Write a protein that binds this ligand. Sequence first.
Ligand SMILES: Cc1ocnc1CCNC(=O)c1nn(C)c2ccccc12
Ligand SMILES: [Zn+2]
Length: 139
Amino acid sequence: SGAIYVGNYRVVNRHLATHNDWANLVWEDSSRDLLVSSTTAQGCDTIARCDCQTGVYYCSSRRKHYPVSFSKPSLIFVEASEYYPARYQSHLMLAVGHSEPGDCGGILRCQHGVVGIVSTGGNGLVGFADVRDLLWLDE
Ligand SMILES: Cc1ocnc1CCNC(=O)c1nn(C)c2ccccc12
Ligand SMILES: [Zn+2]
């Protein structure tokens, strides 16, 4: 689990969005596994605006943060789970690292701010849904 709080928005994995997230829907993209809902409280996370390929992510299944190198956001085939059939996921970044399903929502951060959230994984790889292109999160 996990979310990003920036301005009047909450960014979550679309497969983990709650009934309240869907009732306050701002934008969602199934191919990205992202959903953004509106909030009453102002959030103060900072979204990175950069092309970094190194950063640190939180891994709840190890209670640890790990530094990784990751690929630029791209269209990648992702195997099925109970939440989606196998399909191409867009704006996905991969790194070598540990993850389990419940690690979704863990934040990846570089020196500039939040890069994305854990979304996929397996075989020693962890995939992150990028948020750096969503310029509207700051306005
Ligand atoms: C976005 C997406 O695509 C398909 N199902 C999902 C959503 C469900 N995701 C997973 O099942 C999953 N997430 N991570 C980090 C893992 C690590 C090891 C094994 C499985 C997973
Ligand atoms: Zn950066």
